[PDB]
Design a protein around this ligand. Structure first.
Ligand code: SAM
Ligand code: 7QO
Ligand code: SF4
Ligand code: SF4
Length: 327
């Protein structure tokens, strides 16, 4: 059994205003507690978890995020945080001293003039880049998440050499996901600008993780451009559901991957309950049933997968294993 990733949606509140996320302008009051994390830690330790990644709205708004990293690290967990970067320069020193192993910053443009518009938060791009440079010199692994659609794909060649020059060592480039259909006016122009980004020398240019956001095979690219179906785990099986646990903190839901919490599917809550009798438990029979469904059906029904997770499952299918921070 491999080293698993545990996502915790610490909170839903956020300080940004992104057009594409439900937590834009969220002032929700739920806060995942240190008491919850103390009960969860031994359960994740025996569940084979080696990575705990904090997400949500904006985790740097959680007043305990540094103490959570400190306690997770003291239990042997490789700690990671996904942030929009606005507060990262102010907290990266304390986070690094607390044992933070990886920082993920979400950038959706090659410059402040575009990113700060997409997230409607002037100064967020600049603070994200500072926090990445500061994390690099503090020994933290710097990764960037990018969401790309018709509105910003021409910026990706510029973001690539910005990230490269800044010392970022991992880059997720995944497609915009919305309920409504997403159509590019000219898919050939998307390939003409973005194929060189993926065809760059990884020795000199940061090329993104996993699959290309518009697909790798001609069939995947047709399914993405013509029918807005995002690339997912190929092959017959998805193996991400064995290595990833995503805890929707506010509600009581645990998911077998980091994209299934954002799906629609049924109407009753997705995933499985995190608690059985007020007691936090992992890999419950309901959770194993939830994961078993998407292990078989994921490659066939999942319209909201990410490029990182698709490449993760494929490496398990072809190679039998993944490198440390492949998720
Ligand atoms: C919900 S955010 C929470 C962490 C932090 N607030 C941030 O943005 O980096 C987690 C990731 O999901 C991405 N995301 C948000 N809305 C998305 C969408 N509609 N389609 C694809 N990715 C999305 C964001 O870019 C971010 O990298
Ligand atoms: N509408 C959305 C919004 C976010 N996500 C996923 O959220 C994950 C997280 O919350 O941590 C991220 O790691 C991942 O990059 C992103 O793709 C999604 O799948 N669909
Ligand atoms: S900063 Fe993160 S949580 Fe907030 S609206 Fe943007 S993507 Fe959503
Ligand atoms: S195929 Fe489905 S279950 Fe598997 S990683 Fe992608 S979204 Fe998750």
């Amino acid at each position: 059994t491999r080293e698993r990733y545990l996502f915790i949606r610490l909170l839903e509140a956020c300080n940004a205003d992104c057009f594409m996320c439900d937590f834009a302008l969220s002032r929700d009051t739920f806060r995942f507690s240190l008491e919850d994390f103390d009960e969860l830690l031994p359960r994740a330790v025996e569940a084979g978890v080696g990575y705990i990644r904090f997400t949500g709205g904006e985790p740097l708004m959680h007043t305990d995020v540094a103490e959570l990293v400190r306690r997770g690290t003291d239990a042997g967990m490789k700690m990671s945080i996904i942030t929009n970067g606005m507060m990262l320069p102010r907290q990266i020193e304390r986070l690094a001293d607390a044992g933070l192993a990886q920082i993920i910053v979400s950038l959706d443009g090659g410059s402040a003039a575009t990113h700060d518009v997409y997230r409607r938060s002037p100064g967020m791009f600049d603070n994200g880049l500072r926090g990445l440079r500061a994390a690099a010199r503090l020994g933290v692994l710097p990764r960037v998440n990018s969401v790309v659609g018709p509105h910003n794909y021409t910026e990706m060649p510029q973001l690539q050499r910005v990230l490269t020059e800044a010392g970022v060592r991992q880059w997720e480039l995944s497609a915009l996901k919305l309920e409504r259909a997403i159509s590019y006016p000219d898919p050939d122009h998307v390939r003409a600008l973005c194929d060189p980004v993926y065809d760059a020398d990884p020795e000199h240019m940061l090329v993104p993780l996993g699959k290309r956001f518009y697909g790798d095979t001609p069939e995947e690219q047709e399914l993405y451009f013509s029918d807005s179906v995002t690339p997912r785990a190929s092959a017959p099986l998805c193996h991400v559901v064995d290595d990833v646990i995503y805890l929707d903190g506010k509600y009581g839901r645990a998911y077998a991957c980091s994209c299934l919490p954002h799906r629609e599917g049924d109407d009753e809550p997705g995933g499985a309950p995190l608690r059985e009798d007020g007691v936090i438990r992992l890999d419950t029979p309901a959770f194993r049933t939830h994961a078993d469904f998407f292990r078989t059906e994921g490659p066939r029904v999942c319209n909201g997968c990410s490029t990182t997770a698709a490449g993760y499952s494929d490496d398990i299918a072809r190679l039998g294993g993944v490198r440390p921070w492949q998720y």
